[PDB]
Amino acid sequence: NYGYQPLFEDRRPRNIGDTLTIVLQENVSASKSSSANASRDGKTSFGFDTVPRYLQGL
């Protein structure tokens, strides 16, 4: 090979045949949450158990 080569550079790959080292160190994490609620409660009462003579009509 007659190609020029720098002395002080970091010897990065530059041509087709050059080799490079890859450190994967891949780490991905995704999360998703959702919630919903709805509560309705009702309860009504009414009773005499004793009615006046004048109110017995109703």
Partner 1 sequence: FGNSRADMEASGGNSFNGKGGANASNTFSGTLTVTVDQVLANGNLHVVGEKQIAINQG
Please say which residue, 22 or 58, places its beta carbon nearer to ligand TQN. 58
The span from the CA of 20 to the CA of 14, in Å, is 10
Please say which residue, 16 or 30, places its beta carbon nearer to partner 1. 30
Residue 57 binding result from ligand TQN, partner 1, none, given CB thresholds of 5 to 8 Å by partner type = ligand TQN
Which residue has 């970091």 as its token pair? 10
Q: Determine phi and psi for 33, rounding to 5 degrees.
A: -145, 155
The span from the CA of 14 to the CA of 5, in Å, is 10
* 38 near partner 1 (CB under 8 A): no
* 58 near ligand TQN (CB under 6 A): yes
